Amino acid sequence: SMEQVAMELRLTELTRLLRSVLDQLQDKDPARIFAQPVSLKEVPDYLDHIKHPMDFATMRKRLEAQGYKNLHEFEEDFDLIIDNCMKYNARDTVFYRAAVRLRDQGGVVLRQARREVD
Ligand SMILES: CNC(=O)c1cc2cccnc2s1
User: Fold this and answer.
1) Cross-link Glycyl lysine isopeptide (Lys-Gly) (interchain with G-Cter in SUMO2) maps to which residues of the chain?
2) The domain spanning residue 27 has which CATH number?
């Protein structure tokens, strides 16, 4: 149907917009602290602490699979990255401070993405 095609076109362009947003957000993490899943080899008990792990690479995989239906779902995943980090790591760590900076600096980027979506 033309309708299903039209939807897939919207979804494809949403994916295109979110891809840009993802690249911008990841630029706010120059140290690549949030680039990959927390290694269960380097941190074997992590899953006892964090029930829903998230990272930029995992977000990217979902993105290219067009697994984000709207911005809210995308923001959910970004928020997990930040919130997980700030629970697992203590306040006076390079990890926690990185999350804070990503949170603050990403707020700008998501504020406009929200408008560009409507
Ligand atoms: C988002 N990444 C984290 O919260 C990490 C925490 C720790 C702790 C020790 C060694 N490596 C890592 S990575």
Assistant:
1) 41
2) 1.20.920.10
Q: What is the resolution of this structure in A?
A: 1.8
d(CA 107, CA 24): 11
Distance in Å, CA 21 to ligand 1 centroid: 24
CA of 8 to the centre of ligand 1 (A): 38
Please provide the size of the chain in residues.
118
Q: How many domains does the chain have?
A: 1
What single string gives the DSSP state of each residue in 22-72? HHHHHTT-TT-TTSSPPPTTTSTTHHHH-SS---HHHHHHHHHTT---SHH
- Both structure tokens of 63: 């993105």
Residue 88 Cβ contacting ligand 1 at under 6 Å: yes
Method used experimentally: X-ray
Q: Assess contact for 85 and 98: CB atoms under 8 A.
A: yes
